[PDB]
């Protein structure tokens, strides 16, 4: 077994595979979120685009992790992908709340894997997470908090109007 | 009678002529809708443009149908065009409601003609409807549903403000 | 009722609505004329283009009139559009004869409306007709007379050949 | 036998091979028609070009059919190509009459194959015919009817002059 | 429930959701196939690219289906995604064998859904499958059969050399 | 009979018509050869392109001959086109063997016609063959011999690998 593998614990290999599952789960969640906002009875295009873009980003993170797994001589192993936690996601506010919960879980998974890499003395893993994941997550979580604050401000009284305005003037489409 | 006509039933020929009447009726309805929104006491320019654009699209569909009638060796026959169902169209919401009702009737007419073509074993007619009409109608009806949802969200409380905002931030002009 | 309306009689308002009906009728007549010449058993493409172009021009005149109706604070009211006077239009000669009869009726309607505007002391209406309609009609009627003369010259003896030649060498396609 | 073949009946496979023969026959007919009009004692260049262009179109249709046969896992089988029905094709009128008869036979073959695909529940075949053949045939047959009408109009009295004029002013070269 | 929904059976809606699951499953299978060929102990880059490209194509098909679901007024419902059938995919030959089996299953699912649309008289669904899926699948399955034949020819005697050569001279990277 | 014909024997006229049949036969043979190599169970794209290109070249030669027939005042006469000698063409080697046999027969037909032109003292015919056919055939036959030699060298031991390599590194696609 691997001719290239060096300083790459079975523990980190397994944890990388679990993280791939988590990122692909998050991608699937964002696919569901995106298409919910494209429903004719929800129709918030900018919200749809925001979530579909994140579906792509999460999928990219999984592919980054799989490439890394191979560069270290580990073996990608895929598991069932569980469906998203909801079939309908409520208002933009509800949806952003669910998204920041999801991001925080990914973030905690990254931190846990960092702490494993540190215990296993694996500086290439630590560097890899710092280079492509930790700051990325921090920036996204901040953006989502900014959004939540703006949504929140808009939707006390006149909830519908606030939702429309946030979609039109903050979100991209 | 026609040197080119082949596999083209008198039933489909008549039904094509009726569909032309329906599309020209819808065009006239959208002309009336467009100019209502240009009234100084209504003054929603983006709404006016949205309906005038559809008047053009419906007229184009009628001309497509007439060209097809001729390519198959059928004979265009024109009937009186009935005036639109209303002289005043109310709010943007009322107007979009009336437009989606109209589109659904055109859609049902297309489906009925498809079902006739299928019973008459006329695959060129079926192809023609699929190529230029069925998806076009589906996309338009979806857009209108999206609009209705957004209008609806805006006009619970503060009806005037919501109407202005929808016109300014969703509709084109 | 209208905050903008000034010096705009109910008589001119009604007459503008009737003129809109006439122009849309003429547009429909030219649509029928155009597609007749596209029949495989008539097949005079340049004739078809000449009439379809006029269908567009007449529709534009109606839209000009409706825009004016709104700029003056009048209220567009639409009536049933009667179908064209014939289902088949004969030869190019027959068709041009029918077209110049139609244009003369539009012209007389314009003159009558001018005479109303003059009796109502409505110089904006008079200016509007002079700017966009009266000369336009005069030029078109002259063109049609030129055509009739050329068609007429061609179709004494050898009627078919003359018809083909006029279509090929005078009409555009 | 084929690793790719799926939902592709032996009946449709055979019928596709027969259609290839028909299209290559039609191509050969148009080659003969083209070169007849290039004879120094016929010399109607535009007619020659019109038929040679159709020879190419028919050959292209056969190649489209053969490519499809292969994409479905069927087996192209070629038969003898029968020579065209005439060695001399008469006037432009005679020739256009013969061409529209030929096109109608191809059209009927396409319809028959459509009806077979429908009975065999082969929606890829149906789509393939709709995409590349049915409308193409309808447009060509209409063009030919237009031509026949114009030729017919020209060649009552002064047959030679009419023939020259049609070739010069309608046909391309 | 939906203001836009018209002629859209609950049966087709459910079947569209199942097809989305199948396409996302196939995408996941191709992700696993792609990264297997990127393993340092397999190292066939062109094979990896071929499968990763198909992972993207299958994901795109699912998104096309979800967009359609929304345009018709149906409701996207997501299920668990089962992991791919194998963790290791053997040789290029083994892998292409598995891929054509997968494609044929997608193809059969498309055909079944076509047959449902036909039984439900849903011509927009039928058109949608013809426009974006049926020919696409046919072309891909043909390409894969071509590949299988070439792989097969190369890997009787000198299996390693044949595998390298196919990757270098047929597959893209 | 012909006003232009000069120094053009009935013998050469007939022989030109036979040569046209031969060239169109060869074109049909190459069409069959081309599509055989496009079969999913043969799949040698470069071989397919090589033969389809020759189908076009042979057809061009027939059209050159027909144009010449007309320029001399002869009369093109078309006969039945016999189907190709095989339905399946074996390996690339088998196919190239069959192609060089065919070319040699065309070449011998050209030589025979040259010898007829010489006996009939027809220097325009001789020039015509020298200008457009004799060298063309010589170059093609040489190319095919080169190919046969290279195929032959490759397919002693490891027949499949040799076939793939010849297609990839010598033939165009
Ligand atoms: Au979305
Ligand atoms: Au979106
Ligand atoms: Au998007
Ligand atoms: Au770390
Ligand atoms: Au570390
Ligand atoms: Au990165
Ligand atoms: Au954002
Ligand atoms: Au308007
Ligand atoms: Au407007
Ligand atoms: Au507009
Ligand atoms: Au249909
Ligand atoms: Au049909
Ligand atoms: Au269209
Ligand atoms: Au819109
Ligand atoms: Au026209
Ligand atoms: Au026209
Ligand atoms: Au036109
Ligand atoms: Au006046
Ligand atoms: Au006046
Ligand atoms: Au004007
Ligand atoms: Au003119
Ligand atoms: Au020709
Ligand atoms: Au020619
Ligand atoms: Au030509
Ligand atoms: Au069919
Ligand atoms: Au079918
Ligand atoms: Au095509
Ligand atoms: Au033409
Ligand atoms: Au890959
Ligand atoms: Au790759
Ligand atoms: Au790739
Ligand atoms: Au279907
Ligand atoms: Au259907
Ligand atoms: Au597509
Ligand atoms: Au490929
Ligand atoms: Au080929
Ligand atoms: Au090829
Ligand atoms: Au080719
Ligand atoms: Au000679
Ligand atoms: Au000679
Ligand atoms: Au030459
Ligand atoms: Au070559």
JSON list of N, CA, C and O in Angstrom, two decimals, chain D residues 62-83:
[
{"chain": "D", "resi": 62, "resn": "UNK", "atom": "N", "xyz": [-29.46, 11.17, -46.22]},
{"chain": "D", "resi": 62, "resn": "UNK", "atom": "CA", "xyz": [-28.98, 9.81, -46.10]},
{"chain": "D", "resi": 62, "resn": "UNK", "atom": "C", "xyz": [-27.81, 9.63, -45.11]},
{"chain": "D", "resi": 62, "resn": "UNK", "atom": "O", "xyz": [-27.82, 8.72, -44.33]},
{"chain": "D", "resi": 63, "resn": "UNK", "atom": "N", "xyz": [-26.80, 10.46, -45.17]},
{"chain": "D", "resi": 63, "resn": "UNK", "atom": "CA", "xyz": [-25.69, 10.38, -44.23]},
{"chain": "D", "resi": 63, "resn": "UNK", "atom": "C", "xyz": [-26.15, 10.64, -42.75]},
{"chain": "D", "resi": 63, "resn": "UNK", "atom": "O", "xyz": [-25.65, 10.00, -41.84]},
{"chain": "D", "resi": 64, "resn": "UNK", "atom": "N", "xyz": [-27.11, 11.54, -42.57]},
{"chain": "D", "resi": 64, "resn": "UNK", "atom": "CA", "xyz": [-27.70, 11.78, -41.25]},
{"chain": "D", "resi": 64, "resn": "UNK", "atom": "C", "xyz": [-28.37, 10.50, -40.77]},
{"chain": "D", "resi": 64, "resn": "UNK", "atom": "O", "xyz": [-28.10, 10.02, -39.67]},
{"chain": "D", "resi": 65, "resn": "UNK", "atom": "N", "xyz": [-29.20, 9.91, -41.62]},
{"chain": "D", "resi": 65, "resn": "UNK", "atom": "CA", "xyz": [-29.83, 8.63, -41.29]},
{"chain": "D", "resi": 65, "resn": "UNK", "atom": "C", "xyz": [-28.80, 7.53, -40.96]},
{"chain": "D", "resi": 65, "resn": "UNK", "atom": "O", "xyz": [-29.02, 6.75, -40.01]},
{"chain": "D", "resi": 66, "resn": "UNK", "atom": "N", "xyz": [-27.69, 7.44, -41.69]},
{"chain": "D", "resi": 66, "resn": "UNK", "atom": "CA", "xyz": [-26.68, 6.38, -41.45]},
{"chain": "D", "resi": 66, "resn": "UNK", "atom": "C", "xyz": [-25.95, 6.62, -40.14]},
{"chain": "D", "resi": 66, "resn": "UNK", "atom": "O", "xyz": [-25.72, 5.71, -39.36]},
{"chain": "D", "resi": 67, "resn": "UNK", "atom": "N", "xyz": [-25.62, 7.87, -39.83]},
{"chain": "D", "resi": 67, "resn": "UNK", "atom": "CA", "xyz": [-25.05, 8.19, -38.59]},
{"chain": "D", "resi": 67, "resn": "UNK", "atom": "C", "xyz": [-25.98, 7.79, -37.43]},
{"chain": "D", "resi": 67, "resn": "UNK", "atom": "O", "xyz": [-25.51, 7.22, -36.44]},
{"chain": "D", "resi": 68, "resn": "UNK", "atom": "N", "xyz": [-27.27, 8.12, -37.57]},
{"chain": "D", "resi": 68, "resn": "UNK", "atom": "CA", "xyz": [-28.26, 7.74, -36.57]},
{"chain": "D", "resi": 68, "resn": "UNK", "atom": "C", "xyz": [-28.32, 6.20, -36.39]},
{"chain": "D", "resi": 68, "resn": "UNK", "atom": "O", "xyz": [-28.37, 5.68, -35.23]},
{"chain": "D", "resi": 69, "resn": "UNK", "atom": "N", "xyz": [-28.31, 5.47, -37.51]},
{"chain": "D", "resi": 69, "resn": "UNK", "atom": "CA", "xyz": [-28.36, 4.01, -37.51]},
{"chain": "D", "resi": 69, "resn": "UNK", "atom": "C", "xyz": [-27.24, 3.47, -36.62]},
{"chain": "D", "resi": 69, "resn": "UNK", "atom": "O", "xyz": [-27.45, 2.68, -35.69]},
{"chain": "D", "resi": 70, "resn": "UNK", "atom": "N", "xyz": [-26.05, 3.98, -36.84]},
{"chain": "D", "resi": 70, "resn": "UNK", "atom": "CA", "xyz": [-24.90, 3.62, -36.01]},
{"chain": "D", "resi": 70, "resn": "UNK", "atom": "C", "xyz": [-25.00, 4.06, -34.54]},
{"chain": "D", "resi": 70, "resn": "UNK", "atom": "O", "xyz": [-24.63, 3.29, -33.65]},
{"chain": "D", "resi": 71, "resn": "UNK", "atom": "N", "xyz": [-25.50, 5.26, -34.29]},
{"chain": "D", "resi": 71, "resn": "UNK", "atom": "CA", "xyz": [-25.62, 5.74, -32.88]},
{"chain": "D", "resi": 71, "resn": "UNK", "atom": "C", "xyz": [-26.60, 4.86, -32.09]},
{"chain": "D", "resi": 71, "resn": "UNK", "atom": "O", "xyz": [-26.38, 4.65, -30.93]},
{"chain": "D", "resi": 72, "resn": "UNK", "atom": "N", "xyz": [-27.58, 4.26, -32.75]},
{"chain": "D", "resi": 72, "resn": "UNK", "atom": "CA", "xyz": [-28.55, 3.35, -32.10]},
{"chain": "D", "resi": 72, "resn": "UNK", "atom": "C", "xyz": [-28.16, 1.87, -32.06]},
{"chain": "D", "resi": 72, "resn": "UNK", "atom": "O", "xyz": [-28.82, 1.07, -31.40]},
{"chain": "D", "resi": 73, "resn": "UNK", "atom": "N", "xyz": [-27.08, 1.51, -32.74]},
{"chain": "D", "resi": 73, "resn": "UNK", "atom": "CA", "xyz": [-26.62, 0.15, -32.72]},
{"chain": "D", "resi": 73, "resn": "UNK", "atom": "C", "xyz": [-27.23, -0.68, -33.81]},
{"chain": "D", "resi": 73, "resn": "UNK", "atom": "O", "xyz": [-27.04, -1.85, -33.84]},
{"chain": "D", "resi": 74, "resn": "UNK", "atom": "N", "xyz": [-27.88, -0.04, -34.76]},
{"chain": "D", "resi": 74, "resn": "UNK", "atom": "CA", "xyz": [-28.33, -0.73, -35.92]},
{"chain": "D", "resi": 74, "resn": "UNK", "atom": "C", "xyz": [-27.21, -0.93, -36.94]},
{"chain": "D", "resi": 74, "resn": "UNK", "atom": "O", "xyz": [-26.06, -0.39, -36.83]},
{"chain": "D", "resi": 75, "resn": "UNK", "atom": "N", "xyz": [-27.55, -1.69, -37.98]},
{"chain": "D", "resi": 75, "resn": "UNK", "atom": "CA", "xyz": [-26.57, -2.01, -39.00]},
{"chain": "D", "resi": 75, "resn": "UNK", "atom": "C", "xyz": [-26.98, -1.53, -40.38]},
{"chain": "D", "resi": 75, "resn": "UNK", "atom": "O", "xyz": [-28.02, -1.95, -40.94]},
{"chain": "D", "resi": 76, "resn": "UNK", "atom": "N", "xyz": [-26.20, -0.57, -40.90]},
{"chain": "D", "resi": 76, "resn": "UNK", "atom": "CA", "xyz": [-26.43, -0.02, -42.24]},
{"chain": "D", "resi": 76, "resn": "UNK", "atom": "C", "xyz": [-26.33, -1.18, -43.20]},
{"chain": "D", "resi": 76, "resn": "UNK", "atom": "O", "xyz": [-25.36, -1.95, -43.15]},
{"chain": "D", "resi": 77, "resn": "UNK", "atom": "N", "xyz": [-27.28, -1.29, -44.10]},
{"chain": "D", "resi": 77, "resn": "UNK", "atom": "CA", "xyz": [-27.23, -2.26, -45.19]},
{"chain": "D", "resi": 77, "resn": "UNK", "atom": "C", "xyz": [-27.64, -1.48, -46.41]},
{"chain": "D", "resi": 77, "resn": "UNK", "atom": "O", "xyz": [-28.75, -0.85, -46.43]},
{"chain": "D", "resi": 78, "resn": "UNK", "atom": "N", "xyz": [-26.82, -1.58, -47.45]},
{"chain": "D", "resi": 78, "resn": "UNK", "atom": "CA", "xyz": [-27.00, -0.87, -48.69]},
{"chain": "D", "resi": 78, "resn": "UNK", "atom": "C", "xyz": [-27.55, -1.79, -49.78]},
{"chain": "D", "resi": 78, "resn": "UNK", "atom": "O", "xyz": [-27.15, -2.96, -49.88]},
{"chain": "D", "resi": 79, "resn": "UNK", "atom": "N", "xyz": [-28.47, -1.24, -50.55]},
{"chain": "D", "resi": 79, "resn": "UNK", "atom": "CA", "xyz": [-29.03, -1.94, -51.72]},
{"chain": "D", "resi": 79, "resn": "UNK", "atom": "C", "xyz": [-28.70, -1.20, -53.02]},
{"chain": "D", "resi": 79, "resn": "UNK", "atom": "O", "xyz": [-28.26, -0.06, -52.97]},
{"chain": "D", "resi": 80, "resn": "UNK", "atom": "N", "xyz": [-28.93, -1.87, -54.14]},
{"chain": "D", "resi": 80, "resn": "UNK", "atom": "CA", "xyz": [-28.82, -1.28, -55.43]},
{"chain": "D", "resi": 80, "resn": "UNK", "atom": "C", "xyz": [-29.60, 0.03, -55.46]},
{"chain": "D", "resi": 80, "resn": "UNK", "atom": "O", "xyz": [-30.69, 0.16, -54.85]},
{"chain": "D", "resi": 81, "resn": "UNK", "atom": "N", "xyz": [-29.03, 1.01, -56.16]},
{"chain": "D", "resi": 81, "resn": "UNK", "atom": "CA", "xyz": [-29.72, 2.28, -56.37]},
{"chain": "D", "resi": 81, "resn": "UNK", "atom": "C", "xyz": [-30.31, 2.33, -57.76]},
{"chain": "D", "resi": 81, "resn": "UNK", "atom": "O", "xyz": [-29.59, 2.32, -58.77]},
{"chain": "D", "resi": 82, "resn": "UNK", "atom": "N", "xyz": [-31.61, 2.40, -57.82]},
{"chain": "D", "resi": 82, "resn": "UNK", "atom": "CA", "xyz": [-32.20, 2.42, -59.09]},
{"chain": "D", "resi": 82, "resn": "UNK", "atom": "C", "xyz": [-32.00, 3.76, -59.76]},
{"chain": "D", "resi": 82, "resn": "UNK", "atom": "O", "xyz": [-31.98, 4.82, -59.09]},
{"chain": "D", "resi": 83, "resn": "UNK", "atom": "N", "xyz": [-31.86, 3.69, -61.09]},
{"chain": "D", "resi": 83, "resn": "UNK", "atom": "CA", "xyz": [-31.63, 4.89, -61.86]},
{"chain": "D", "resi": 83, "resn": "UNK", "atom": "C", "xyz": [-32.89, 5.77, -61.80]},
{"chain": "D", "resi": 83, "resn": "UNK", "atom": "O", "xyz": [-34.03, 5.33, -61.61]}
]
